[PDB]
């Protein structure tokens, strides 16, 4: 029922979202305050002393930090932000949010889970940035800071602040401060509005390009997001046409003809995308009847409301009140038939079923066949036969014919006998049992086996079934230029019907018996009449009962029912006109008549593959899960319908339908659904692309985070991962129902989608859908590619570390140590340690020794190499045996980590500072399950001669990792002692290099913090607003 609902109405994703704020995800923060006031530079020198608002922080130290939408001002929160804290505070909690359920320590995180975590992080980094950049408004500059440019205005109070973070080229440059120097060297003319598309005098600009702070990365992301939606856009006329085409003319809508104001209306998706979701759709329903039934009932009603046909039983009773008979008689053909008919639901449903015979097969309920089988000697049973014969042909059950046959055969037992196939499916076996092809009796296909002498009636009944059973046909429906096509096994726009449809040429109906189903009634009666006048059956009834029986049969034959007519002329249309509006589009499989060789015997879907099979087409046949269930209808009712149809007195089809359908075409639920399908597919691909980063798949794919460690992943860790990817998606698109759940069954490492059905003769038909692209996926892999460079900005350090004592007064950054201090596996006289490593205690003064990897035993001194794991698996023992030598001795170890989170501790260079206490804790808190952020002790850069003092260090990195650093003493004229770093020009290329195009970015090696951003202002009106109907 959770599934049931999702079929009728699935939560529609929130696609369009706007951001009026800044398009950036990185912010510059102050770490160590400025040295003001000081003993050398008089305070009257610094800009900050005059309350001048600066573009960057005025402080001794400043670093970049990741913080999605820190400047954004949106309409809808995608609640998927990624917020980091300054490197001087612990960030560990961001890299342990996933598989560290077993991680005890709060300050610690498990390294083998790093990649998994980082990955998911990037996924959210994208999700949280999926907005359209909205255009606000400007104001010309009333000052001379800029040459009368147009400065964009952010909304919200407390805005004056932004105008200075927004445009750096606007600041004045009186100082020789590191900041002013930068500013001063920038091109003047690239600020404010750059270009615009003004179409209507006195309306908004359609869009504007403008210079202003932002980051090339998130700008690109949003760029492709808009690109993807821009493709889904359709215009009023296209919709007019589409809708008009679906309604088959009965309804007429209108679009305007004149200059518009640009509207973004994303709804057009590829057929591929529709098929893929129609499979997912089918998947979670197969075999469970109670899920598909409510769907049929819905359509059942929809029909009742639109169809001009009305069932009025009194018709049968009237004609029957004129049947001639005697009162001294024991039986009454007239009466009995009425009491058997007990004069709808089942009728309307049976029709609906025609649209989904792919997964649902309607059948006549067992309860409708005679308990014992019946006997041609029972008037009661003769009517029972009648009822069934008239109903069967309306079911989708491909075995109906054989049942219609056997139904009589069962009653004829002993009277007329035929050669059955074997001893199990005997002439007396309940007709309702011949439910599969393998059961169709020989004599049913080769009529000649039935003796025209020993079994005249039975034979004739067969000849009829053969020559008069309805011939399937088809009718075209829908409008794929806009809605694409959900058809899988049939051609687009094709709707199969188990009946012959001959469109009507008039609008003012009149009773007509020239119908397929009308003959069927006729034949059936004529047969009965013959069974009665049969020279060896007629002697058992009073000469009077016969006359009555005949009379009755004639009245049934010549009854004035409209149903048969309606079924041939209108019904098919009604269906075709509804089809396009259904939430769950039709899913059919060819209706074959008596060509059993082509009867459908199986339909299945796959969503995983096997062993080493990588091609869908090969694993399909052996990895599909069969689908489908039977639904039983009441033969009684159905017949009464076919017997008492009636049209309104003065009916005029062309008008009637014009009224009945109009309202149905004012329900834009259709369009909404498209957007869902759109996502359902983005979700799928996003899964495979990410999953393929922590595990080995069958899909070709990028790979950039291979340096970040990750555990050997089992089908379990895989699923758990998937589950998060899932959640986050739903959360960001405001979905509350299912998505990916259908695919999540067990192991996702080999997901694939395909469906197939098979005939009796064994021929099979496959359908592998073409995976369309994915913007979400591409964007993740993009930011991943950038992560591979700007990793420090994300609080992650690359390489290894070297725990060793290093005391001196020098001021280098431990995150950018000096070469001669680092060593590696290929350095001379270095000892690597492996698995067989053990320790042999010292004795009688001798030294203790640990075992090499080649089996050499060395003393606790020199340069060793330990893979992190090795220490983790022995924390206590090692800390106990080595710590003492690391601290005051001559031992230096290089722990191999690959990637790790880091935390900084700044200190005053003029005062003694020993980092042992810090690193002691680290080492001691290492576990076979966790490690805390690596701590670094770095000096505070200064802008003036300062005395010097010793500093004892223990941890340094293996390669540069100080890229997080933005600037030192930003407000002073120069940094004299400590790490010196001037504002990173590379990041402001558009401003610092005059020969560069405004639209140039430098990804994925460098993220520019100032680019050209395109802001739109397109309208997003509701369809009913521009496409109007004509009542």
């Amino acid at each position: 029922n959770k599934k049931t609902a999702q079929l009728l109405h699935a939560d529609t994703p929130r696609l369009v979202t706007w951001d009026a704020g800044l398009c950036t995800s990185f912010k510059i923060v102050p770490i160590v305050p400025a040295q003001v006031p000081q003993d050398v530079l008089a305070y009257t020198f610094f800009t900050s002393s005059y309350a001048i608002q600066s573009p960057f922080p005025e402080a001794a130290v400043s670093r970049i930090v990741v913080h999605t939408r820190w400047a954004s001002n949106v309409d809808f929160d995608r609640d998927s932000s990624v917020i980091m804290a300054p490197p001087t505070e612990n960030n560990i909690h961001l890299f342990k949010q996933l598989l560290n359920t077993e991680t005890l320590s709060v300050r610690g995180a498990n390294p083998l889970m790093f990649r998994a975590n980082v990955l998911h992080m990037l996924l959210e980094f994208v999700l949280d940035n999926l907005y359209l950049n909205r255009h606000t408004g400007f104001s010309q500059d009333h000052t001379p800071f800029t040459e009368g440019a147009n400065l964009r205005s952010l909304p919200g109070p407390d805005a004056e602040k932004w105008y200075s973070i927004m445009y750096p080229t606007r600041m004045g440059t009186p100082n020789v401060s590191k900041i002013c120097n930068f500013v001063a060297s920038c091109v003047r003319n690239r600020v404010g509005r750059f270009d615009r598309a003004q179409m209507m005098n006195g309306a908004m600009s359609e869009w504007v390009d403008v210079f202003e702070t932002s980051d090339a990365l998130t700008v690109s992301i949003r760029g492709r997001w808009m690109a993807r939606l821009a493709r889904m856009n359709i215009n009023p006329t296209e919709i007019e046409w589409a809708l008009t085409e679906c309604a088959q003319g009965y309804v007429t809508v209108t679009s305007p003809y004149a200059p518009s104001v640009n509207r973004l209306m994303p709804y057009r998706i590829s057929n591929a995308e529709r098929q893929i979701s129609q499979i997912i759709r089918i998947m979670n329903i197969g075999n469970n009847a109670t899920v598909i039934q409510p769907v049929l009932q819905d359509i059942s009603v929809l029909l009742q409301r639109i169809s001009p046909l009305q069932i009025d039983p009194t018709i049968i009773s009237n004609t029957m009140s004129t049947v001639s008979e005697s009162t001294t008689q024991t039986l009454s053909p007239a009466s009995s038939i009425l009491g058997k008919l007990r004069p709808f639901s089942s009728f309307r449903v049976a029709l609906a079923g025609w649209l989904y015979n792919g997964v649902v097969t309607t059948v006549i309920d067992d309860s409708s066949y005679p308990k014992d089988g019946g006997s041609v000697t029972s008037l009661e049973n003769l009517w029972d036969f009648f009822i069934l014969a008239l109903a069967l042909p309306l079911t989708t059950d491909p075995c109906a014919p054989v049942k219609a046959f056997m139904t009589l055969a069962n009653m004829m037992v002993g009277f007329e006998t035929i050669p059955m196939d074997n001893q199990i499916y005997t002439q007396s076996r309940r007709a309702s049992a011949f439910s599969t092809p393998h059961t169709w009796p020989r004599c049913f296909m080769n009529i000649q086996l039935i003796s025209p002498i020993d079994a005249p009636i039975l034979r004739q009944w067969a000849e009829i079934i053969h020559r008069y059973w309805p011939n399937p046909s088809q009718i075209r429906y829908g409008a794929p230029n806009v809605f694409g096509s959900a058809n899988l096994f049939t051609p687009p726009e094709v709707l199969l019907l188990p009946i012959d449809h001959q469109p009507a040429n008039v609008t003012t109906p009149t009773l007509d018996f020239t119908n397929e189903l009308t003959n069927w009634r006729a034949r059936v009666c004529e047969l009965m009449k013959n069974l009665v006048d049969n020279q060896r059956y007629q002697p058992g009834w009073t000469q009077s009962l016969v006359s009555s029986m005949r009379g009755t049969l004639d009245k049934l034959k010549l009854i004035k029912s409209m149903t048969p007519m309606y079924l041939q002329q209108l019904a098919p249309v009604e269906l075709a006109v509804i089809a396009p509006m259904l939430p769950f589009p039709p899913f059919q499989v060819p209706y074959v008549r008596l060509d059993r060789d082509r009867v459908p015997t199986m339909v299945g879907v796959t969503r995983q593959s096997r062993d080493t099979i990588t091609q869908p087409a090969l694993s399909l046949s052996t990895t599909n899960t069969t689908v489908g269930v039977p639904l039983a209808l009441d033969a009684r009712a159905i017949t009464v319908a076919l017997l008492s149809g009636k049209y309104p007195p003065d009916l005029v089809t062309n008008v009637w339908y014009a009224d009945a359908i109009y309202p149905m075409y004012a329900d834009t639920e259709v369009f909404s659904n498209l957007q869902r399908d759109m996502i359902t597919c983005e979700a799928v691909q996003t899964l495979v692309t990410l999953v393929a980063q922590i595990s080995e798949t069958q899909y070709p794919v990028d790979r950039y985070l291979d340096w970040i460690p990750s555990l050997r992943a089992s089908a379990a860790t895989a699923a758990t991962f998937a589950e998060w990817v899932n959640t986050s998606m739903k959360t960001a698109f405001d979905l509350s129902d299912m998505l990916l759940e259908p695919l999540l069954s067990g192991d996702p490492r080999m997901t694939q989608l395909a469906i197939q059905y098979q005939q009796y003769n064994g021929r099979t038909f496959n359908v592998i859908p073409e995976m369309p692209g994915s913007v979400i996926a591409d964007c993740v892999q993009l930011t991943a590619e950038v992560f591979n460079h700007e990793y420090n900005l994300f609080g992650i350090a690359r390489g290894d570390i070297i725990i060793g004592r290093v005391q001196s007064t020098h001021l280098w950054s431990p995150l950018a140590p000096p070469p001669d201090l680092v060593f590696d596996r290929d350095t001379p006289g270095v000892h690597i340690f492996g698995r067989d490593c053990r320790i042999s205690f010292g004795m009688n003064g001798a030294a203790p020794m640990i075992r090499d990897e080649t089996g050499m035993m060395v003393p606790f001194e020199g340069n060793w190499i330990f893979p992190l794991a090795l220490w983790q698996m022995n924390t206590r023992y090692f800390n106990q045996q080595f710590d003492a030598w690391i601290k005051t001795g001559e031992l230096r170890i290089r722990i191999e980590m690959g990637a790790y989170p880091y935390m900084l501790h700044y200190y005053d260079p003029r005062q003694y500072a020993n980092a042992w206490n810090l690193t002691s804790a680290w080492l001691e808190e290492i576990t076979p399950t966790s490690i805390p952020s690596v701590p670094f002790m770095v000096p505070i850069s200064s802008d003036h001669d300062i005395s010097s003092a010793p500093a004892v260090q223990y941890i340094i990195s293996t390669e540069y990792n100080d890229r997080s650093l933005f600037c030192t003493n930003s407000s002073s004229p120069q940094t004299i002692a400590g790490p010196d770093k001037h504002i990173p020009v590379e990041r402001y290329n558009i401003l610092t290099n005059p020969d560069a195009p405004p639209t140039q970015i430098q990804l994925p090696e460098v993220v520019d913090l100032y680019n050209v951003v395109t802001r739109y202002a397109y309208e997003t009106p509701p369809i009913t607003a521009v496409v109007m109907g004509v009542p």
Binding site: R467, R476, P590
Partner: protein, 214 residues
């Protein structure tokens, strides 16, 4: 496009009894055995079947379309007259025509004109529903051969009978392989370089003569 219902070709009399010596009626004696789709240009008929079921098989007479360019769509009715087989309208139509040409190929006299040069119906659309082992397929081969001029080593009676057809079909379905160099293609009709037929010279569309097919 104009959909025109194919009328009965043979009207069964009362004496009929599916007797060995009764004539085959190739299902063309029943209600609707095929639907015809006329238009004045193939490009259109083709595009018409983009959105229309064709599982049953679509036949075409590229020679002298009995009433204008048109495609024939078979229905799902069948011929039981010739046991122990059960033929589908499509297969039937193929069969009857195929034999009709195999016949004409023998009574071929240079100065004596015939209604159509190639009497074989060629399967244009819906071949993906027919397997390399189905009658519908082998009939395509036979049809091709007949068009290209092959002659049956067997004698074909002036008047056909069920027993005969039954026999023929029986041969068509026996073990063995296609010894000739001709294979069915929806694409168009193949005419061997050194074939007697001259249709390609009498029609503007439908046939193609392969130079390296001898």
């Amino acid at each position: 496009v104009l959909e025109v219902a194919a009328g009965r070709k043979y009207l069964q009399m009362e004496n009929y009894s599916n007797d060995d010596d009764d004539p085959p009626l190739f299902a063309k004696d029943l209600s609707d055995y095929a639907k015809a789709f006329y238009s004045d240009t193939y490009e259109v008929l083709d595009r018409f079947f983009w959105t229309h079921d064709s599982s049953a098989g679509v036949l075409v007479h590229y020679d002298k379309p009995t009433n204008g360019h048109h495609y024939l769509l078979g229905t799902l009715t069948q011929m039981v007259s010739a046991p122990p087989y059960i033929i589908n309208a499509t297969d039937a139509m193929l069969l009857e025509s195929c034999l009709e040409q195999f016949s004409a190929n023998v009574r071929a006299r240079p100065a004596q004109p015939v209604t159509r040069l190639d009497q074989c119906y060629h399967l244009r659309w819906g071949a993906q529903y027919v397997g390399e082992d189905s009658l519908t397929y082998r009939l395509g081969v036979l049809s091709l051969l007949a068009t290209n001029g092959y002659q049956l080593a067997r004698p074909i009676p002036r008047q056909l009978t069920n027993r005969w057809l039954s026999s023929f079909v029986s041969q068509i379905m026996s073990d063995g392989v296609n010894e000739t160099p001709l294979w069915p293609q929806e694409r168009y009709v193949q005419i061997a370089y050194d074939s007697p037929s001259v249709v390609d010279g009498a029609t503007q569309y439908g046939y193609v003569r392969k130079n390296q097919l001898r």
